[PDB]
A paper describes a structure:
Here, we present a workflow that utilizes the SPT Labtech chameleon – a next-generation nanospray cryoEM grid preparation device – in an aerobic environment to freeze O2-sensitive proteins under functionally anaerobic conditions, which we term (an)aerobic. Demonstrating the utility of this workflow, we determined high-resolution cryoEM structures of deoxygenated human hemoglobin (Hb) in various liganded states and the molybdenum-iron protein (MoFeP) – the O2-sensitive catalytic component of Azotobacter vinelandii nitrogenase – in a reduced state. Our workflow maintains (an)aerobic samples by protecting against or eliminating O2 contamination prior to loading into the chameleon, during sample aspiration, and throughout sample deposition on self-wicking EM grids, respectively. Finally, we detail the effects of O2 contamination at different stages of the workflow and show how to prevent their effects. Together, we demonstrate reproducible high-resolution structure determination of O2-sensitive proteins of varying complexity and size – as small as 64 kDa – with a workflow requiring only minimal modifications to a robust, widely available EM grid freezing method.
To demonstrate the O2 sensitivity of MoFeP during traditional aerobic grid vitrification, we first froze cryoEM grids of NaDT-reduced MoFeP using similar conditions as deoxyHb but without the protective oil layer or NaDT in the cryoEM sample buffer. Using our chameleon protocol, we prepared grids of MoFeP and obtained a 2.39-Å resolution structure. As expected from previous studies of nitrogenase under conditions of O2 exposure, we did not see any obvious changes or damage to FeMoco, but an inspection of the EM density around the P-cluster suggested that it was in the 2-electron oxidized P2+ state, indicating O2 perfusion through the sample and oxidation of the P-cluster from the PN reduced state to P2+. However, the P-cluster is also highly sensitive to O2 exposure and is rapidly oxidized under aerobic conditions, that results in significant alterations to the metal cluster geometry and coordination. When the fully reduced PN resting state of the P-cluster undergoes one-electron oxidization to the P1+ state, the Fe6 atom that is initially coordinated to S1 in PN becomes coordinated to a neighboring serine within the beta subunit (β1S188) (red arrow). A further one-electron oxidation of the cluster to the P2+ state leads to the additional coordination of the Fe5 atom to the amide backbone of one of the coordinating cysteines in the alpha subunit (α1C88), which is accompanied by the dissociation of the bond between Fe5 and the bridging S1 sulfur atom (green arrow). Both of these linkages are present in our aerobically-prepared MoFeP structure, confirming oxidation of the P-clusters to the P2+ state following O2 exposure during grid preparation.
Author numbering:
A (entry chain A), D (entry chain C): 4 to 480
B (entry chain B), C (entry chain D): 2 to 523
Write the structure that this text describes.
């Protein structure tokens, strides 16, 4: 709104920084223009954070262990290093799964080597081999081990690749070494890249020579959906109602066998482009599997995605797609009729990770809500290429925003709702602004698909229109 | 499908028939899952004594630990000083994890910064990182003090904090008079309580070591109180209240209760309350220093006794009747203030509650875990109530602490069946609750999974969890509770007896089967 | 059979095979029990809407009421005065029942006497009973005051308390200067709160009616506080604390929190604390009188407004956020004292808790019952939290109270599904929870049986109970809680959200069935 | 010992009373002499309480509704009068039963007429008839109605007998009017008598002309056991192991059919003589059924009672009795070996209602405990005749003791343990004396039989030896 005001606000916020930090941060804040197609001319992304400025970014270990490898349920994932990292990331992400924990599923469990001073001084490869033996003894029904590195592993001269090779040859088990040390990269995105490379190098090609899996022309894989609150399940059902067959989903509620069967499918359906574009491009190049993006956020995006997917197949699939759309139309129409009057005209600001800042806009507009600012923690420039056409004119765009910047922007813009993570929720709640968690769904969800849209609308209404937001000022003040 | 009048979240929407059929098809078609009988057999095997024998032979594998790393405790200590910014020299993922952990436990904003060291500093060092970070942090958030700790990355590369901060001051990145205390907090040594101790010792040294010439012991007629790692605001509150009721001058060093309990009134306060720099500079002039949790304040005790020349009393944590009495009498002796009648009445009221609930408390068996001082205080209180500690676990405890706990257990007839485990994790504890079933568990939220496992074996094998400790993520506002003093003892007693009574109520709710014992009066 | 190492009480010893066979033989041989299918059919019928229609047609039969009789409240009021003996003119069985009831709720000694009226007095009246009882009570227990109430026995024959006490004083059984206030408390009128009101009005009249000539309003710069029937000691504590923090002079009339919270230190104190006779004599000199529970203090309000000439403010019970704010501003206006920053911060902290827990609180459905003022304060707080009160029951409420509650409900969008029932008992409430299932119930211990009934229908039909109210017999030390002010609102909010979270935890503990939603972080 | 000291203590305590109260109370306190067989020459009982002295006694409504009629599970018991009495007595007594509450069992429920002023002025007989109609409508599986009167019913002139007769003829149901008004009598004892008379007049003789019940020579009834904590059950099993057949059980876990079948048995086994001697004597006079007392408190009394019962039958019953005693000997021997060392030499003071002050001495002596004082709330002089021979020389005997007397006697005697009710528990707990509830078993039990003796010993040890009794004095005091 009123572009010159937004640029003035940007300058006023930047006035406080030292010259180096101000000059750097000036390249990461922008005023959106929907006509612009290339983001390199307006915003700069995927760079190192300025020291001492309260960034929100994580590390490559979080991007690899917590995002990509952790949701794999039948594998045991071992945090190689000191005790803190696996403890802070244990069950913090709501990647839902079905299994018997401790027997054949291990998602919420924390396996670690628990480095001491002696391990730092004299290495930890012998400890790693002994620990792998112990894992094999105590958890027989596991189907593969991954070793996720923390910072000291890369800092000291540890060679986890040789240990993994020897122990895998000895036990006839898949052991995947992931060099996802924290100091690599600038954020979790290099963790995504490293985890995808490990998947390609150690898992994806097991059944290249195997041809015992019967294949159908309607075989698809779900890539980049991590089943937050059941999200992937809420997507999968729709695809099965269309008549497709979902051979695998990466990686929420995912098994290693599904990953190894993925090269046998006819189409890849990529949900999170940011974290899985590497593996999808590799399979297109190697196995010739086409991949396409889809968006199941809100009825409009869901219907458009379903039609786009069905067009990739024959006419029976399109007929089933129309049947599914007709079946689900009354339910989301009822949701819209109930909740749009309570949410029309509200203004939303978002600060999320790599995919969701632009994916959720359509669902918000399906309830009459306008997104006035958005930003990414770690996403690349192609993500901003998509976002710039996704958003409106004179809206605010921020990359790797600092706490001070986000607080000042929110003070000036005064949105009705903010969607961000755990580290901004209470900051903006004490400020008197409704806040929804857009990583964990505030322990609600799923939000994907038609069944998720109802939950999304109910949550928006329950937080935006709660009475507690009208009680922050004492009557005597 | 969703009904707009009654919308279902993940539970119980995924229990619908269509979702169940989808999940069954997925598992049968593409997961290559083990047969359910094989899974049941392996679970039953994991509940046995042979599995426990194999489990306790572990040497290299840790499963579900019960501790964190040092810089988390260093951050918590730094948060307790006035207008102080916690600054972790190292990698930014650590700070993200620390802030998320404390946000989930306290449900409050937690402020901390890092200098964001990357692969470049892995060979050059983080000197430029520290210069730029100190300048940026001071310019942007305007702290009166920056308390510097370390991550394992900078510890492994061997970064010299003292030299780097001195070079930052010398070259003009920050003023020479600006306080920047620092502490090395290697995460491969000790745990979070060790980091708290290290950070406190660093701050105290920074403010007192070079200016001890004009210090006279007892000049300000105050007693220094060092709480240690504490995640209950009620504990700070009760210590302050008890000291104020005695009319005893005191100085609580590292007090974060104000900054972790800010009001929601339309503004964000990054800083609130805390120990002032004047208090820390005047601390050597106190009569004495009392350490509330002495089993992770060894470095602090060494510094206070050696430098400040304070004869630190040998006191246990003021938890439960006897130790609260001993703490009050020691404070009275140090300050010369008589114990007031209000505290005597409060002690009598706690004793009255104990007399009222002893019948339901007697003979109950508890597994428990946590931090060393917290754990031994719990064991002492449980012994005082006639309860039976059986499995006592402390992942970050040592051999001297275990010897002290064994001495406590031997003094009581209710400690006959108790075993103390040091260096054991919660998978060991799961084996223990399966093989020697207690009545209840006491611990943090990570125990909930253990309960789930016990419920899988059978309803008669379930071990309910009572949430006392850190962190508690699945309940709201339990961090406002108290575990110290008579008031904390009353809260713990109420929670224990009412947990017992809800378990009994649940076990006797079956109509015409067990509800003959569903008594109105208990 | 018993194993000496693990002895079994009634539960679960009577679940052994021999006891089960004995019970089956007894039932099959000598009880002539109905077939189990007939019992199941009748239970299912009692859970239906036709049964509810028949149940609400009741005119003469009361099943499981939610109220007591007047002399119980009169005894509770009398206990709040210094060295005062409650004395019930009538039958001794009433006093035995009153003392047992209060002993089970408070877990403390409760002192009360009777004159033990029998059939001889049923013919000739209880004048000699009163003379001998007053003399014996004064000689034996040495009270400074004897507060006389009545049982229905003495009410029916029409015993004249005034004349009988006057004849006792005239003939020398007790001194003329000894205070003996009295009140008629017919148990077939009203309920226990009515008895509290009657006893307080009698005591106030006795001490103030004849000496009003030298009384000037506002002379002592105090505010009178009348609490009414209250069974939470924390409520007295919080009112006194809040008034002291404002620096407001006050006089709490009928304060029993000291005599219901005596310490266990080796001696028995029959009397402890309480309102003095000087305070009651000086009450007309206050600036004003504030009634905390105005819906059962109508007689007291009439006396205070007519005789003391105090312009009693129109205030609701200080429960929740808005009503606590209104109470504080009214007190500030009356006394001229500004509201301190500590109370502002406490209000902000409560608002912060509300903001933290609104997601788990929103849309929840509650059935609730209790006393009128407590019920309406609870409804107001639940509306403030975004919760849905659905079945609001108050056995001792009237039509004006119902109109006020309906006005409260209509002002809020969350009150659209609420129905208020006056004169209905807990069998009606059982029908309501069966036919329109809420998420939870709020009430006293008598609700536990309702939960049992719901569990008999099926696990998906269980309505868990949250114990707030009087009496609570199956939990320990809940009477120490607070329901007034910001602190009481915080306690109630914590209890509600944690009850919701324990229910969710229990519902998602099934391994590989529902434990996909067994989240560590909630 | 020290009889002179005990008498001096009695005089010192009595010194405070006024002349009339002192003269009356002097007849209710005594120093026991085991050689004395006539209590009327020693102590006086069953008299009215002195006004204003804080007695412990209840009323006749408590003795009838709460003790005798309430445990009958298949009957609905209606408190006729104002709301208080049925509310204070609802589920306060732990008479255990098996049944579906609200359908075919009604023990813990409170049925009342809830009198108002209009009912007082214009009577409540029409209300009673309407209420009986509503009871029949809403609780079809009930097997009989009893109407328990409160004080106003007897004071206003209501004719409940006519209503009961008319409605019983109309509905073909047994309706029992009980005139248990509170002001009659001096305690619960007249309630026992009135309830027994109602049983005799309205229930006991229903099957006098019915001879379809097959009878055996081993038919016994349990009379006066109210199944507190399951006590009656813990007795019944032993009798069934002896080979007897328990036809009825009065009245804990009791049904109206058992009461009606009682006149068909061969022997009556009376536990509480005080509350059931009336009905047992009536059945001896009318049906010729002999009755005998028994005591199942502690192994010694249990064994003696079992042998005394078996002597009333043939040799097969005696052989079974010997088998039962041999079977149960090791268990109570183990209990004694475990708990007597912790309880030897302790001194006990008791004050219970009408049977238990003398019945529990043997169990205490089985653990090496000496009872130094005992007393009754409401028991008669034959109870003291039975009591005096069971207690030691120069021990204290008190009838209808006052709170002041009880406190002073405990202060002078300093017992290690006190067993009394709810209204003395906390009084003696704040004094620092261990206290056990001897009415409700402190929500524990059963205490009858061999299975109950283990619970009794564990409870005595857990309360007497609890650490909290050593913590009442602050270390700085
Ligand atoms: S993987 Fe990525 S930060 Fe694509 S690291 Fe992050 S479960 Fe975010 S915006 Mo948390 S690139 Fe997924 C994400 Fe998006 S953990 Fe989740 S919500 S769609
Ligand atoms: S950036 Fe990432 S989270 Fe940080 S360490 Fe590095 S991989 Fe890990 Fe675990 S132990 Fe603690 S938190 Fe660190 S300082 Fe040593
Ligand atoms: S001696 Fe006994 S208990 Fe007393 S009344 Fe009489 S039968 Fe009953 Fe119920 S209602 Fe209250 S308590 Fe009485 S005063 Fe009117
Ligand atoms: Fe908060
Ligand atoms: Fe008590």
């Amino acid at each position: 709104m009123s572009r010159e005001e937004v640029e003035s606000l940007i300058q006023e916020v930047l006035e406080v920084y030292p010259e180096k930090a101000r000059k750097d941060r000036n390249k990461h804040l922008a005023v959106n223009d929907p006509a612009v197609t290339q983001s390199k001319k307006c915003i700069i992304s995927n760079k190192k954070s300025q020291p001492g400025l309260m960034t929100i970014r994580g590390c490559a270990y979080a991007g690899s262990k917590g995002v990509v490898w952790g949701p794999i349920k039948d594998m045991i994932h071992i945090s190689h290093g000191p005790v803190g990292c696996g403890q802070y990331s244990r069950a913090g992400r709501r990647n839902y799964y079905i299994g018997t924990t401790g027997v054949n599923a291990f998602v919420t469990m924390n396996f670690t080597s628990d480095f001491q001073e002696k391990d730092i001084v004299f290495g930890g490869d012998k400890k790693l081999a002994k620990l792998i033996d112990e894992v094999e003894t105590l958890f027989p029904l596991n189907k593969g081990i991954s070793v996720q590195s923390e910072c000291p592993i890369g800092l000291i001269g540890d060679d986890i690749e040789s240990v993994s090779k020897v122990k895998g040859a000895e036990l006839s088990k898949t052991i995947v070494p992931v060099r996802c040390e924290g100091f690599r990269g600038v954020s979790q995105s290099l963790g995504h890249h490293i985890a995808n490379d490990a998947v390609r190098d150690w898992v994806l090609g097991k059944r290249d020579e195997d041809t015992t899996f019967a294949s159908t022309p309607y075989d698809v894989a779900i890539i980049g959906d991590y089943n937050i609150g059941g999200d992937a399940w809420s997507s999968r059902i729709l695809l099965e109602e269309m008549g497709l067959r979902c051979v695998a989903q990466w990686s929420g509620d995912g098994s290693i066998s599904e990953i190894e069967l993925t090269p046998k499918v006819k189409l890849n359906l990529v949900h999170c482009y940011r974290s899985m574009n590497y593996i999808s491009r590799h399979m297109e190049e190697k196995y010739g599997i086409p991949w396409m993006e889809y968006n199941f956020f809100g009825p409009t995006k869901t219907i458009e995605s379903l039609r786009a997917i069905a067009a990739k197949f024959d006419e029976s699939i399109q007929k089933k797609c129309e049947e599914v759309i007709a079946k689900y139309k009354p339910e989301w129409e009822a949701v819209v009729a109930k909740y749009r009057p309570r949410l029309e005209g509200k203004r939303v600001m978002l600060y999320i990770g790599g995919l969701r800042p632009r994916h959720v806009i359509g669902a918000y507009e399906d309830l009459g809500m306008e997104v006035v600012g958005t930003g990414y923690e770690f996403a690349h420039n192609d993500d901003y290429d998509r976002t710039m056409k996704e958003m409106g004119d004179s809206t605010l765009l921020y990359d790797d925003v600092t706490g001070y910047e986000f607080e000042e922007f929110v003070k000036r813009i005064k949105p009705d709702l903010i969607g961000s993570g755990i580290k901004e929720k209470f900051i903006f709640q004490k400020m008197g602004i409704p806040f929804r968690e857009m990583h964990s769904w505030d322990y609600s969800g799923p939000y994907h698909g038609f069944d998720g849209f109802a939950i999304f609308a109910r949550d928006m209404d329950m937080t935006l229109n709660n009475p507690c937001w009208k009680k922050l000022q004492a009557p005597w003040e | 499908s969703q009904q707009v009048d009654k919308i279902k979240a993940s539970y119980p929407l995924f229990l619908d028939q269509d979702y169940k059929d989808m999940l069954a098809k997925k598992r049968d078609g593409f997961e290559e899952k083990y047969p359910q009988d094989k899974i049941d057999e392996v679970f039953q095997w994991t509940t046995t004594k042979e599995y426990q024998e194999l489990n306790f032979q572990r040497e290299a594998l840790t499963v579900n630990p019960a501790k964190a790393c040092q810089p988390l405790g260093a951050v918590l200590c730094a948060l307790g000083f006035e207008k102080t910014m916690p600054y972790v020299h190292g990698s930014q993922g650590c700070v993200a994890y620390f802030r998320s952990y404390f946000n989930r436990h306290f449900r409050e904003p937690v402020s901390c910064v890092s200098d964001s060291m990357t692969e470049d500093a892995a060979v050059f060092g983080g000197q430029q990182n520290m210069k730029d970070g100190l300048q940026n942090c001071k310019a942007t958030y305007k702290p009166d003090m920056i308390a510097v700790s370390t991550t394992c990355m900078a510890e492994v590369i061997g970064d010299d904090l003292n030299a780097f901060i001195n070079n930052s001051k010398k070259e003009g990145f920050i003023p020479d008079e600006f306080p920047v205390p620092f502490a090395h907090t290697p995460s491969f040594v000790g745990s979070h309580v060790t980091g708290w101790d290290n950070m406190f010792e660093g701050i105290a040294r920074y403010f007192t070591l070079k200016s001890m010439d004009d210090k006279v012991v007892g000049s300000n007629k105050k007693i220094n109180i060092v709480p240690g790692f504490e995640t209950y605001l009620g504990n700070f509150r009760v210590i302050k209240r008890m000291l104020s009721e005695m009319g005893v001058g005191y100085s609580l060093l590292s007090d974060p209760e104000e900054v972790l309990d800010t009001p929601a009134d339309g503004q964000f306060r990054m800083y609130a309350g805390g120990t002032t720099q004047e208090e820390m500079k005047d601390a050597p002039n106190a009569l004495n220093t009392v350490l509330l949790q002495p089993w992770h304040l060894e470095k602090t005790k060494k510094f206070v006794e050696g430098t400040w020349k304070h004869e630190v009393p040998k006191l246990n944590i003021p938890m439960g009747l006897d130790w609260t009495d001993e703490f009050l009498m020691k404070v009275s002796e140090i300050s010369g203030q008589p114990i007031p009648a209000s505290l005597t009445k409060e002690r009598g009221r706690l004793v009255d509650m104990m007399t009222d609930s002893h019948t339901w408390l007697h003979g109950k068996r508890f597994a428990l875990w946590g931090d060393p001082d917290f754990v031994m205080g719990l064991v002492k209180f449980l012994l005082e109530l006639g309860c039976e500690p059986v499995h006592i676990l402390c992942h970050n405890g040592n051999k001297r602490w275990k010897k002290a706990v064994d001495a406590i257990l031997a003094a009581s007839p209710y400690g006959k069946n108790a075993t103390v485990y040091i260096g054991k994790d919660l998978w060991h504890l799961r084996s223990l609750v399966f093989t020697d079933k207690p009545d209840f568990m006491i611990g943090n939220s990570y125990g909930k999974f253990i309960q789930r496992d016990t419920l899988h074996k059978g309803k008669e094998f379930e071990v309910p969890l009572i949430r006392i400790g850190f962190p508690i993520f699945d309940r709201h506002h339990l961090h406002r509770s108290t575990t110290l003093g008579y008031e904390g003892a009353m809260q713990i007693l109420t929670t224990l007896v009412n947990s017992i009574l809800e378990r009994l109520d649940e076990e006797t709710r079956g109509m015409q089967a067990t509800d003959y014992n569903h008594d109105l009066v208990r």
